[PDB]
Amino acid sequence: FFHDILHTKYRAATDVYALMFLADIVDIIIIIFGFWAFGKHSAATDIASSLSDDQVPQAFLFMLLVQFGTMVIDRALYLRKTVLGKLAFQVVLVVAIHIWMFFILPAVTERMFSQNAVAQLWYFVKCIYFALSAYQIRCGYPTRILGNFLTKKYNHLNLFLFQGFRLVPFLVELRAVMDWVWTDTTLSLSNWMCVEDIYANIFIIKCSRETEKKYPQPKGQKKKKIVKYGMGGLIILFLIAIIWFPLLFMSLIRSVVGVVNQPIDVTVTLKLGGYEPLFTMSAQQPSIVPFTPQAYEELSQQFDPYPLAMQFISQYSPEDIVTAQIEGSSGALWRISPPSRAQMKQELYNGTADITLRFTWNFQRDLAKGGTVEYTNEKHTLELAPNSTARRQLAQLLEGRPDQSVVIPHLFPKYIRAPNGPEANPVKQLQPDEEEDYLGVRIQLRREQVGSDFLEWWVIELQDCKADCNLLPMVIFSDKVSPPSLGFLAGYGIVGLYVSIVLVVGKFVRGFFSEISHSIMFEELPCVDRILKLCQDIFLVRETRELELEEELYAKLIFLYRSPETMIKWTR
Amino acid sequence: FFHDILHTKYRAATDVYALMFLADIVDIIIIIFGFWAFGKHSAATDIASSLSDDQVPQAFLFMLLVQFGTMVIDRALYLRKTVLGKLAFQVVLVVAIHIWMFFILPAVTERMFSQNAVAQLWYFVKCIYFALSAYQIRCGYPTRILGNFLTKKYNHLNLFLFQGFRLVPFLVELRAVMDWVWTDTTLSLSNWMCVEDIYANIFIIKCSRETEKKYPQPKGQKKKKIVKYGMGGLIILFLIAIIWFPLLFMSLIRSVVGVVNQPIDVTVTLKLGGYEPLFTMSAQQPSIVPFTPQAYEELSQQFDPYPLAMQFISQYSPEDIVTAQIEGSSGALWRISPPSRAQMKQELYNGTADITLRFTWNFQRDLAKGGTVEYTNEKHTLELAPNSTARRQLAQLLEGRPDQSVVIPHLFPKYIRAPNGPEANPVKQLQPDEEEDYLGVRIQLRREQVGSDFLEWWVIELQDCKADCNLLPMVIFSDKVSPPSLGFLAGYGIVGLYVSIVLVVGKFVRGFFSEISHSIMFEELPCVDRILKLCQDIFLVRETRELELEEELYAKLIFLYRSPETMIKWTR
Amino acid sequence: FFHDILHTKYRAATDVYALMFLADIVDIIIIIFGFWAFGKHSAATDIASSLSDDQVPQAFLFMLLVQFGTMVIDRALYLRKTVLGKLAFQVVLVVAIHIWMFFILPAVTERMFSQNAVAQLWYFVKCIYFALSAYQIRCGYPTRILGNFLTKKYNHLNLFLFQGFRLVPFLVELRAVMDWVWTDTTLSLSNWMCVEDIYANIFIIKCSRETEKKYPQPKGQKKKKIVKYGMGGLIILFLIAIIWFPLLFMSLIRSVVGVVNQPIDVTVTLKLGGYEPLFTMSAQQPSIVPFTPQAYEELSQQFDPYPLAMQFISQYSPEDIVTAQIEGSSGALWRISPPSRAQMKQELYNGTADITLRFTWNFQRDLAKGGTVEYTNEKHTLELAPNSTARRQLAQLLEGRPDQSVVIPHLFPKYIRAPNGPEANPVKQLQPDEEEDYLGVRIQLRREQVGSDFLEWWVIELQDCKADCNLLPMVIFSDKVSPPSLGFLAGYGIVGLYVSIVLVVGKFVRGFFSEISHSIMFEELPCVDRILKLCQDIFLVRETRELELEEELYAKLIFLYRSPETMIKWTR
């Protein structure tokens, strides 16, 4: 609607712009005592804008319409422009430093912010930091705008007035800000800069010396020591050492994990030779029963006389142990073909080789909770000798007399470990005689009608079952799992610590002591400038003073910044 | 054949060698307008060989017979023999350094090349770099060979003639080459070297100062500034800053790796209590039908009135969604035991406890395309109350009247998510009343003659099925997968950035400004040598000039290299 | 018992303590010499204690009772105390620094040791290092204890007596120990310290110069060079370069990890359309038969005329290849429903669309041995055209005439690869005409009463089977697996090498040459102190000598340490 209204009338769209332009030109020109105010206003506007975007970034939160993000970008276009105006207003010749350094300190930020959000989000918290850095420059900038009025030399002097409080601010910015900033000063006079860069460093230290002299003289006392002042520096140092030492301690365990694993599914089979399996069963909820403290106490009472068993058991909490209450009636009909059933009967009776009887278990775990290996499994096998009693009795079951059964000794390992890895062995500490400690199993063949041929399925039970012969309770001890191992290979972990200690050493080693630089610097502050000058001549700095002489060619305004040094030199 | 021919005649194999040796001995004794040429020729030969190997390495490509690699190694043996071989000319006394010179700059390379190829290959591209480094030394070396003729001091002087162009070459080699090279000079006089090493650094800077003086004087102008020269340095600096800033921005590139996941297999079951499952079905191609844009539009129309549903749906492209057209006739015969069948009928009719009816789903995905979790699954359960209508009606189905059925309300969750993890929940945004929004299922028993009992299987259908009652369409929304997460733990990612910013800071911090060193250096170049000498005496360098005095003991030829400094000193 | 005895009598517990205390106060002051001996004894005790803990840590080995670890900690409490009293009552009244630097050099260690053990163990080997560092300080400390007697200045002087042997010891400690130690000296006079720190560095070099002068004068010869001395430095340098080239090259050190993979389980199915599968079989041990060298030779003879086949085969050792001897009688009864059976017969005969016949294979591997992908699989499908001979013949089998069969050409791919990834394709190099090279399969339906309808199962055999028609031998070539890939993404691996070369470069670059510092330092050693003093005045060091003047205010004992410098200055 509003867009349409602008479209509807030609006059509103145009002429107006021209008028505005005229105002900007003439106004900026006619506005005798002002433009300076306008520059301040423009700086204020920028700060406000930044806040809005900075405020906007923090404020919206969460995730915002994809289109909305585009609109903000469109909005950013606006910010870039406007500035375009005053850009060459202050601006470049009068103080290009404006649109200049300031101009750079935004384009980089804009690219990062779009990049930072990605699809993941959380960019803004990283992003928000960026806005603040821009803002700090702007606050300096707003005064900055009347640069010819502002006088670059004057701003530094005021901090000198600030002294120790002023000195702290200079320290806070640090080298990195200075290096970026030094370059802009370098950019105006790059060739000197390389020469210039050394001077700026020198100046900084000289400024530091003056600050010490200032508040120091009032502060200074002769043959006077204060315990409290010493303690704060020393207590902090001890804390810093602790953090360096503590941090290594802090991370040494920064890694860790531990959550209970219970197989979701416990699948067991009984299979004779290569014949279709006799029995299959898969237990799931609620047939997989976690140990209560009562179950744990009963298990502990059972194994109390045996320290090795108790040492094993004590590694597990009740929650780490389940009883899989395995139903003994096969879950599926026996699917054997008639010729193979006949072959099996014949092999059992008449075979001259062993026949293998295999009991398998396979425990499934939920990887969503942790761990890396979904299934852990193993098997127990028995070789049934030719003509053996159990073998003939098993064969006899096929004749279909319902009251008959066979006992297979040492078939069922009751206690099994389900570790993090894929091999789940019966627990030797609880079954130290191995297979001799496995339980006997009574096997029967069930047959229903039918009609002669009938459905068939196999039923197993523990030989010594009492209260619940339909169940074969398998006790499973599951080691806990963790999402991340952390260190992984030992060598890599060791190297990182060495890098931490080595890298650390290198950084610690690097600062060193600048005895040569210090001696020249130290004398001058205590030293008189003339004495320093006599001192000064041997070092290059006296030569630099000579370069001061070149100053004479240099333009006076640029000379003045150089001149400030002479005042500094006079102060020296 | 050729090998046999050499074997066949004794004379060709021998005497010849002796003659060759004699010739070699004499060639040294020729001795003038020859041996020097021979040294140059030998250097040429070496360069040629390298290229051949360098040419050979790049040229062969791909993977080459294992035996062929061995032959090349055998060939390398030949090269080594020739080198050290002729090494008795330069050599061990005269062109000592030159002699072994490349001696070191080859053995290290040979070990790496064999190591680099491994079984993976691609070693040569890494490998090829190595040959070039050897070659560069050789080009210097070939002139090098007449070392007594060559005069080490003279070669440095010519670069001085080169000046600014010459200066660039010196800069290009860098510190690392110099440190390795400095040592060889150090090796001849190691004790001085430690003293010597400082001098070489000093010399370099002195050489740099001369170069600046040279082309600089013609170049130099008074009170003259060129915008173009400044711009190139500054534009590059901005680009460098951007790369530093851009590179951090660029890294985000990593974050990315999306591809569609559709379960290959959709397996569902319906199971009453612990009884053999009534119904099982596994849908695979082409029963798993990806959404077309038409299907997506129809789904969008269905859920249009509901913003939360539409917000869910909009997260998926048609390719991310499938309809599993589940066949409602069980894929397997019911395998129950008649006794268990009798128990089930009795429990349904007469049981005083609830009985659970469970509908399960399990979606299999192809890990070869991406992702980490192959199966994602869940279940819906209903507790059928004792004496409830549905329970009695289900029991009635066992009597085998083919026209009968039972409806179980709220059994089939039509809309399910198949996320990256192992838990696949029905979509609440599309089914906000949860189980009340699941679909009713009509169940029938298909018992068939036989002959008593009749082969049995269960058939399910959606209660409100219209056009395709044989199908139960389950709509599955699969989140995309990516091969690599990248950052993994948040702390590690943050640390790397800090290291990048911290490490970066450290490197940036390290260069610093050498004000003390610069001041001494700066004065001398502008400064006259005598004035510098007066300046010179206080620093150790004047003392070094005094060491020059030791030169007198030192051998004159070794003295001359020292002497060059005096000429340099005179130049100073 | 013993604890009870102390409890039983009041007198033993008390009065005694008081007496001891009295003695200690009495012990400290009384005999001319005795306390100094006591300080030495206390230092000895500490060393002994350290050894015991150090001895104890190494000695116990393995893992020790959790309670036992607690007891040791309780023991450590004891160690801390004893000094508790001596902490300031021993007492380092004068050399307070005693309970100082020494006190610090233990608390950090104690925290680390507890942290180091964790639950993993192996902490002690890392832990043991810590004890030794404490011990070294203690040995210095024991003499240290009579600090007023000891004279800090005197200890440094003795090393001067040691000279070159003495010098080596100073070098060994390195910067890191000094920086920590410098601070303690700094702590007494921190403000000077910053000034002081430069002096200590200066002193070190001055000490080094004296050592060179000492043994050097006897050692020194004029115009004399020894080959052997040069060789050791140079040979070591070459070795160091090799280590950097060979040591740094020690990167590939992590490039290998594999053995043999044979599928534990080979599962195959034959399925017509969506009907219940006709045939399923899972082969496991010992039906999965690894190739012998005889089998490998026979396979090589079979494929000898074909270079591409032989190139494929040569990539595998016999151990990498198995024959899965697949039983051709289905492992399960056919579970189809009559109509599912009637529908199938009708579709085979009367259908107007194609019907799909699918042969699948799925190979299971043991991840515990290595690898990442447990199952690898694929399938071969044939579209049986309407009214085709094979389709009608298959339908005919359902009528139950036992002598009948159908041949399906090109159904069984004999040679299949089981690679590291999830897709297991038939080997094209051994079957270049693809499906035309797959083997024909003869299918039969087995069915027996009962006694119309009697159990059914399907039997397949290779069309051209001769000796073992019950088996369908599938030859499977499995690529080896390794536990760790290592490099992973190419860019990351390249960056590390660059960091290794770049990082390395940076460290190599960093040392540089200190020409300015060296020149001042070099002149003084050769230079006379007076001449040096004339030399000395221009540098800050002469100013430092002036600070020496402040010494006058400073306390004489603290002055003496400063005074030692003057003696050093006199030596200069």
Coordinates of C-alpha atoms in Angstrom, one line a residue, chain B residues 341 345 348-349 389-401 404-406 445 458:
Chain B
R341 CA -3.3 -71.6 20.5
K345 CA -8.0 -68.6 23.2
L348 CA -8.5 -64.0 25.6
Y349 CA -11.9 -65.3 26.9
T389 CA -15.5 -56.5 23.4
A390 CA -12.5 -56.5 21.1
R391 CA -10.8 -59.2 23.2
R392 CA -13.7 -61.5 23.1
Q393 CA -14.2 -60.8 19.3
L394 CA -10.5 -61.6 18.7
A395 CA -10.9 -64.9 20.6
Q396 CA -14.0 -65.7 18.5
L397 CA -11.9 -65.4 15.3
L398 CA -10.1 -68.6 16.3
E399 CA -13.3 -70.6 15.8
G400 CA -12.6 -70.2 12.1
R401 CA -15.7 -68.5 10.7
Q404 CA -15.8 -62.7 11.0
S405 CA -13.4 -59.9 12.0
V406 CA -12.5 -57.6 14.8
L445 CA -7.9 -65.0 10.4
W458 CA -3.6 -63.4 9.9

